Amino acid sequence: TMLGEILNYYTHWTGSIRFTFLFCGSMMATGKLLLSYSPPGAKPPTNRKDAMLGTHIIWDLGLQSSCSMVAPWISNTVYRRCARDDFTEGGFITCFYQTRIVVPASTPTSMFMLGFVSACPDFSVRLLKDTPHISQSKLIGRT
Amino acid sequence: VSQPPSTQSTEATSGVNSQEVPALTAVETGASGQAIPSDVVETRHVVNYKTRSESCLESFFGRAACVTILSLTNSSKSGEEKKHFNIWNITYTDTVQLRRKLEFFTYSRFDLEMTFVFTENYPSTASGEVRNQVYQIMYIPPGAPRPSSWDDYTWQSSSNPSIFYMYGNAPPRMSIPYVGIANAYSHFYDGFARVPLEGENTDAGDTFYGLVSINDFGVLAVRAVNRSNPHTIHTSVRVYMKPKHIRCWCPRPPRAVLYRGEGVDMISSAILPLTKVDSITTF
Amino acid sequence: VSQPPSTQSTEATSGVNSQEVPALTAVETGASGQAIPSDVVETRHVVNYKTRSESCLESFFGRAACVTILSLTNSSKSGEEKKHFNIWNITYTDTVQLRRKLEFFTYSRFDLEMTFVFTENYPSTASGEVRNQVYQIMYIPPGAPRPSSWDDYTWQSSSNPSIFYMYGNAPPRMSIPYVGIANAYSHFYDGFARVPLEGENTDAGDTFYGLVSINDFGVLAVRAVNRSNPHTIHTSVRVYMKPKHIRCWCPRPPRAVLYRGEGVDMISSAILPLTKVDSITTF
Amino acid sequence: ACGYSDRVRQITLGNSTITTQEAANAIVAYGEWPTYINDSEANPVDAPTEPDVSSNRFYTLESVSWKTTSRGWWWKLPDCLKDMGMFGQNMYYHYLGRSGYTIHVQCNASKFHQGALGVFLIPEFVMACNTESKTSYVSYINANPGERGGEFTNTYNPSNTDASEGRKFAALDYLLGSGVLAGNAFVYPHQIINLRTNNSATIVVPYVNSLVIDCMAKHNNWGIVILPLAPLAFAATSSPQVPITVTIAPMCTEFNGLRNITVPVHQ
Amino acid sequence: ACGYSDRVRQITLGNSTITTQEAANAIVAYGEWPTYINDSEANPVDAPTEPDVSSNRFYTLESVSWKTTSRGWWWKLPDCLKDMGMFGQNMYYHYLGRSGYTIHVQCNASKFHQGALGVFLIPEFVMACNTESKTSYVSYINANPGERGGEFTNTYNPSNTDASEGRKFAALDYLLGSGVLAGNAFVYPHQIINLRTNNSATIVVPYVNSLVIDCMAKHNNWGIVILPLAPLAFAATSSPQVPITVTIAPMCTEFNGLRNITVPVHQ
Amino acid sequence: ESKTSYVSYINANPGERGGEFTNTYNPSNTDASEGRKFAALDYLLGSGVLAGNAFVYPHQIINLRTNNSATIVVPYVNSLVIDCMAKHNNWGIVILPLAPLAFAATSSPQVPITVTIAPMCTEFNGLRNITVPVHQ
Amino acid sequence: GAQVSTQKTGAHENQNVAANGSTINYTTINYYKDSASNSATRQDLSQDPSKFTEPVKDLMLKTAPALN
Amino acid sequence: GAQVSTQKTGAHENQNVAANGSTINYTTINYYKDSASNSATRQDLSQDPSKFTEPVKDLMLKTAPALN
Ligand SMILES: CCCCCCCCCCCCCC(=O)O
Ligand SMILES: CCCCCCCCCCCCCC(=O)O
Ligand SMILES: *C(=O)CCCCCCCCCCCCC
Ligand SMILES: *C(=O)CCCCCCCCCCCCC
Ligand SMILES: [Ca+2]
Ligand SMILES: [Ca+2]
Secondary structure, eight states, rough: OHHHHHTTTEEESSEEEEEEEOOOOOOOBBBBEEEEEEOOOSSSOOOOOHHTTTTEEEEOSSSEEEEEEEOOOSSSSSEEESSSHHHHHHHHEEOOOOOOOOOOOTTTSEEEEEEEEEEOOOEEEEEEEOOOOOOOOOOOOOO | OOOOOOOOOBOOOOOOOOOOOOOOOOGSOOOOOOOOHHHSOOOOOOOOOOOTTSHHHHHHSOOOEEEEEEEEEEEOSTOOSSEEEEEOOOOSSSSSSSHHHHTTEEEEEEEEEEEEEEEEEEOOSSOOOOOOOEEEEEETTTTTTOOOTTSSGGGSSSSSEEEEEEESSSOOOOOOEOOSSSSSSSSOBBBBBSOBBSSSHHHHHTTBBGGGOOOOOOOOEEOOOSSSOOEEEEEEEEEEEEEEEEEEEOOOOOSSSOOSSSSSOOTTTSSSOOOOOOOOOOO | OOOOOOOOOOOOOOOOOOSSSSSSOOOOGGGOOOOOHHHHHHHOOOOOOOOOOSSSHEEEEEEEEEEEEEEEEEEEEETTTGGGGGEEOOTTTTTHHHHHHHHHEEEEEEEEEEEEEEEOOOOOSSOOOOOOOOEEEEEEETOOOOOOOOGGGGOOOOOOOOOEETSSSOOOOOEOOOOSSSSSEESOBBBBBSOOOSSSOOOTTTTTGGGGGGGOOEEEEEEOOOOOOSOOOEEEEEEEEEEEEEEEOOOOOOOOOOOOOSSOOOTTTTTTOOEEEESSTOO | OOOOOOSSSEEEEEEEEEEESSSSOOOOOOOOOOOOOOOOOOOSSSOOOOOOGGGGSSSEEOOOOTTTTTEEEEETTGGGGGGGHHHHHHHEEEEEEEEEEEEEEOOOOTTTEEEEEEEEEEEEOOOSSSSSSSSOOHHHHHHHHHOOOOOOOOOOOOOSHHHHHSSBBBBBBBGTTSSSOOGGGGSSSEEEEETOSEEEEEEEEEEOSSSSSSTTTTOEEEEEEEEEEEEESSSSSSHHHHEEEEEEEEEEEEEEOOOOOOOOOOO | OOOOOOOOOOOETEEEEESSSSSSEEGGGGGOOOOOOTTTOOOOOOOOOOGGGGGSSOOOOOEEEETOOOEEEEEEGGGGTSSHHHHHHHHHEEEEEEEEEEEEEEEEOOOEEEEEEEEEEESSOOBBOTTSSSSOOOHHHHHHOOOGOOESSSOOOOHHHSSSSSSSSBBBBBGGTSSOGGGGGGGGEEEEEEHHHHHOEEEEEOSSSSSSBBBBBOOOOOEEEEEEEEEEESSSSSOEEEEEEEEEEEEEEEEEEEEEEOOOOOO | OOSOOOOHHHHHHGGGGGGOBBBBBOOSSOOHHHOOOOOOOOGGTTTTTTTTGGGGGSSSOOOOOOOOOOOOOOOOSSSSSSSTTTTTTOOOOOOOOOOOOOSSSSSSOOOOOOOOOOOSSSSOOOOOSSOOBBBO | OOOEEEOOOOOTTTTTHHHHHHHEEEEEHHHHHHHGGGGOOOOOOOOOEEEEEESSSOOTTTOOOSOO | EEEEOOOOTHHHTTTTTTOSSSSEEEEEEEOOOOOOOGGOOOOOOOOHHHHOOOSSSSSOTTOOOOSO
């Protein structure tokens, strides 16, 4: 993701991440989801009764299409390593149904929602490093 | 004395039960999500001192990146005269690291810092004697006559800017103004070098489309100034570019797949950036 | 103009016969002994000018200590390509001198001065000809792609900081900020990189325990930029670290026994620091 | 205003946030909001423990299901939370506990459904036992279901013999299992989730008791009851079903009398 | 206000007027509005021609159709207007042309449809050619479709042999035919027509280039792309279809270098 | 001595029981279930430093003929403000008999040593489901 | 013709406040006639994320209905 | 932008007093934009041995009974 691609040019990062979702079902479909960020340290939230015990928000589908759930920068170190590392654990963002999407007569019974990620104004990244995301065949020459 | 701008601090907040819902929005508008900790959970007061001091374009592009590697050979053998020099076309597409970064923006404007690193070695077992090498980098702008042989009149450089390196000394380097003939450097170009009129090929254009068809910065004619010795010697010159005093406009997504040619072009061979994940519910 | 603080001077004193006994105390409190000459014997007046000016942490750590020795070989023989470069893991545990000193404190915070010394020589009787060598030290932070061969795209360093040395010139050196992602550098770490939960090995952790399991500063990818010559050449690069602008917290006893690995670990082979003394009454 | 709808509303406590785009205002029980014990009203003299965020947040109970047959549901505060995260721990480690809560009942359908849930918050919700052989005959285990809570029925069949069927509430819907016509259950703080109108119910409630602080492990101050005043209905099937979720959040919680933890009888 | 909805909106230019009762605001590219060349920024010294109303109006392109199979569409400014009334004439009679536009993408359905179109306005929209035998191999004819514009596909099959299939863009949807994940196409001025929310998209865009004025007949500043981020869907058939119409309106247009008219190669 | 920093979480975190120091060092290079534990070598703090200098740490000495208690108040210490407790133990309490217990009567005297700890200024961030580490 | 400026707070440095001592001053004297030859332009931390995160015409404020 | 300071009393130098002549002054001009690049921080002879030799709560004075 744009956020990711950028973080990947640096070594450390700090800040809060903004997860915003846009439900694209039919106007006629209702429902209440539950987005959640559980900071590291315990059994990863497999069920709702566990995700609900951490940072969460009960999103009610309605006229307001989108809904954001923020991942409050909660960390032990002040900066997290960009590369994957256990010391710099991030946490678990999951989702569940608070109730269940409900549609009526003649209404598409299955649809989707788009998930976006962005950084909050308290976000900063440091230590310029090269990015792994691109490769290049050792250049020819002429010898 | 002044204080660099820090990233938003966190002001302490608490509960809520209003008709004010910072959580909900409508990204259809085209506006990104805005919420922050305070809007969603109970926060504490936090004084942030940290700064995006390193994401400043000038810092982000503040490195001498290698753009190309030229080769040339000072040999005394039959067909080793054309080898006695080399002509490189000025550009950053020869590699992919710097290119990708600049490629983050549609347009850019800057001054340039050229730095050169020479590395000579012996090819075959002709591991004999050769005096110290003195190289010459001559910048030949579009329109200027180009060298025929490693030593035709062109290397006079009465007007062309030329560096003279004495192998073993500090990596020669120099600065270049923003020379673009535009108000800015164009990184992409959805157009053709000229307009194909009514009576022409039904394919006209396929030859002159793309930024590459209009951009031109001249070439670097490198060479060793010494004459040919008994034993043949091989040198490799590496060009380094650091755009400084920069500023860019219009952000675009990063190059996600391998680069083919100088244009956008992709290769069916590698166009799967991402990676299969067990399940949508696989942490 | 100012006057550096001197060590306690001795004020003249004499006899005594009071109920004031500076001699006696009770170290059980946890407080060290405090008495000084004056408290015990008759002293004369002495004006002390001397200063602990050299025990200042900045002075005590003010030296470019060698931390490691890397080797690499620019050869033209079959399996001498992987030898054409080397990757060193950034740390001070490779040696013991500097390590022990820093190891005097639990935490520390400082800027770093890197200094490099190159020394090339001929291995076998391949004592022939080879042009001058140009090396490259590339700092590859955690997460950045690492070199596959002594010359794959990675050595572009469009973002990674790289030095280019021209053997024979002054020992390249450079400075590094306090980069720790903590508020200070942690010298020890009584913890595990992550928390092993209920359903796991009854041994989980044995792999990720110790400061070493959480610390990571990236690596130094060194190499010679020249191509392979007839005769093989061997180079040894020595890394020197001098922590400057320093400050440390929580003093701990010095490492008394030989070092095993990067952790505290001892070896039954050598764990007798002290030395037998004839008798408790042997001067 | 910038269109500050009476329907849209957000609520936040601890690290939890509810939202709802179709609510019908919110009510504050008896007009009073949760408060702490004031030095002039105090009783226990030990310094109280006030969990704040660690326990004063939004805990979500296992949803139930609304069927054309559904007769009603019930729960008990603090009971139906005794197992909810940190709140519980504090609740059980202390002899005395005090708290108020924000009740948020959710239940979305579609503009083509019918139905109306009466969400009532009744203080001191005592129900009759199911056995005319004894009186006030209810086991602790049965009285305190927890996250599950009970359900109402529309029939009364006491087990004067089987003493294991007597030791439980006689959840008679048309009488609140109390011996009072449910038709007047509105003299209690309440809201009505009428599907064609709203999909949420928010009722903030303050501690209520003849004492300042009490012993939670023995007493349930409030009782949450939901009765379908209007039967669920859908044009399609004759067996429609919609989920009803209950999310509770304690507030201004404080405890006195700390000791070893309390672990009640269980099965 | 008197109920000035963020949804309802009218737009007028020349003798043309758009209206929409369900839009989601409107966005102004990079926050700047169309302007003219200021005496301090000018380049061509001849007195410019500023058409105003005659050309700065709402031209409507032939609608396209959204199918469950539809992969996306694209167009190019000023290209996709080179034939639009008076604007075109001026565009072609002049060497240099400058302009900004107001893009209005329309697409109504019904409260029972699903779908979401990502309308992006990308500056310098260069796509890869369909032939791995050559590079930047695209014919003028193919690069400049006009009112018709192109379409995106979800497959990449270069014709290294057939040189008449190479001379055209490789409109690979999941990569914008540029070699960049469409998932990040949002770093461009954009709006999303999510059927359950809106039915219009309005994006005002200012001239963008490394120059003040350029030669339109050679260069397309902007590129309009529409990708179904959410597939069209209707409860009824499994082959639903809805029209998508694109109405563009140039603004602050000025041209320099007048001569005989330009007539490019065609078939 | 077959591995380095080889200690299991289970063994590193005994709890109320804590460990004990010994005066011998016998590594189990083979038996990998005896390696995964601390080598509590008393005369070296099991750290490789003479215990004789363990006094450069906050401390007190319970000398029976003088006192019978030891009170040491300690502040949070770390290279960070707050950390993750379930992974890291900031402090370590160690008690070594600098003077051997002794009683005129038996040649096997015994006296109880009790340890009472009290946390202060405790604060936590990042609330979620409860953590339950590996156990036996 | 030299111009002194503030350094970038280092390790054991001024509390982030960068307002402690002249020991954080670095001197600069341009030596060439052409600006292009100068060091990196001074760090500029200004920014307007909005031209990208909110280039919407009518402005909407968090607490309000994005779609009124 | 240069900052002059006192040198470290040498061989045939000012009576330890370090207060004799400007012949004991050294000049310093930081050349880099990053503090990290600077020389060793100025000698600081401050010290509080007590946080280690006497971190006792109730303070005791030499002349008194350590255990009262
Ligand atoms: C003696 C050395 C002369 C070197 C002349 C180089 C000319 C600079 C052209 C600008 C190249 C980078 C701009 C770009 O492609 O974005
Ligand atoms: C071009 C050379 C780059 C060298 C980068 C070195 C990174 C510094 C990490 C700090 C290492 C010492 C800190 C410590 O281990 O206590
Ligand atoms: C302003 O420049 C006054 C301070 C001058 C100090 C001398 C600096 C050294 C000379 C600068 C380069 C001159 C090159 C001809
Ligand atoms: C304060 O700095 C005024 C004194 C300047 C004397 C000139 C010192 C020599 C130049 C310093 C380095 C400048 C690097 C651009
Ligand atoms: Ca701030
Ligand atoms: Ca003195």
